[PDB]
């Protein structure tokens, strides 16, 4: 019964290879979304600035990298801050959430909705234009 067991030991290895392939495909697609959202943001701001003939005021703009804490408008926040600004302490009387900049970018639509399998024709046009030619297959796939 040699042959039978060696068939098992190759289906084991194959299953192991297959799921490591699934993980790296997901990780790769996440990297591709980050590339699209970032280049998309840099271009939108580039054209915006070369229309206003000027870069936005120092405020009114949040530069990457950042994270966002959001809470209801009626939440009471109080804060302590150290002098050097190396330590902050915030109290909230209601729940909050925290989001990384990349997921804010996805919510803005900068990943062209690919993060949701939903993509316009004018969205996959630009999404595919923002990646190297060889990874356009992935982008078309993530738009179902």
């Amino acid at each position: 019964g040699e042959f039978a067991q060696e068939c098992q030991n190759l289906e084991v290895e194959r299953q192991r290879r297959l799921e490591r392939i699934k993980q790296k495909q997901s990780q790769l697609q996440e990297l591709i979304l980050q590339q699209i959202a970032f280049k998309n943001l840099v271009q939108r701001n580039r054209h915006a600035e070369q229309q206003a003939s000027r870069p936005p005021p120092p405020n009114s703009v949040i530069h990457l990298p950042f994270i966002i804490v959001n809470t209801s408008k009626k939440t009471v926040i109080d804060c302590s801050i150290s002098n050097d600004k190396f330590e902050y302490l915030f109290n909230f009387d209601n729940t909050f959430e925290i989001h990384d900049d990349i997921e804010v970018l996805k919510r803005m639509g900068m990943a062209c909705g690919l993060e949701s399998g939903s993509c316009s024709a004018e969205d996959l046009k630009m999404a595919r234009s923002l990646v190297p030619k060889a990874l356009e297959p992935y982008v078309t796939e993530m738009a179902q």
Partner: protein
């Protein structure tokens, strides 16, 4: 036809699964090198930002804090009490590298 010999078929299939794996591994280092070369570099120096309007619309009707802190900075949240205790929530920020910037967006 040749009885069994799923071996040569399974062995051949495992060969291609290696080709698929190192193709993905190679595509990742592509996107990674591609990512850093558009970020770190200087004609995109001042173009990596979102506006007040961008952020407010992702979280319509929320008070908003934008934290700008060195990476690895500790962000600590106490696990809350259950009901029958006062449900208070808290964020503790402590950096070692440099100061932290917190922007009230609202």
């Amino acid at each position: 036809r040749e009885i069994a010999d799923k071996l040569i078929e399974l062995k051949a299939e495992i060969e291609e699964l290696q080709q698929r794996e190192q193709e993905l591994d190679q595509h990742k280092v592509w996107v990674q090198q591609s990512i850093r070369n558009v970020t770190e570099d200087v004609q995109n120096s001042c173009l990596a930002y979102v506006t007040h309007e961008d952020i407010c619309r992702c979280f319509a009707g929320d008070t908003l804090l934008a934290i700008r802190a060195p990476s690895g900075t500790s962000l600590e949240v106490p696990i809350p009490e259950g009901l029958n205790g006062q449900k208070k929530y808290q964020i503790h920020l402590k950096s070692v590298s440099g100061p932290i910037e917190v922007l009230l967006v609202n």
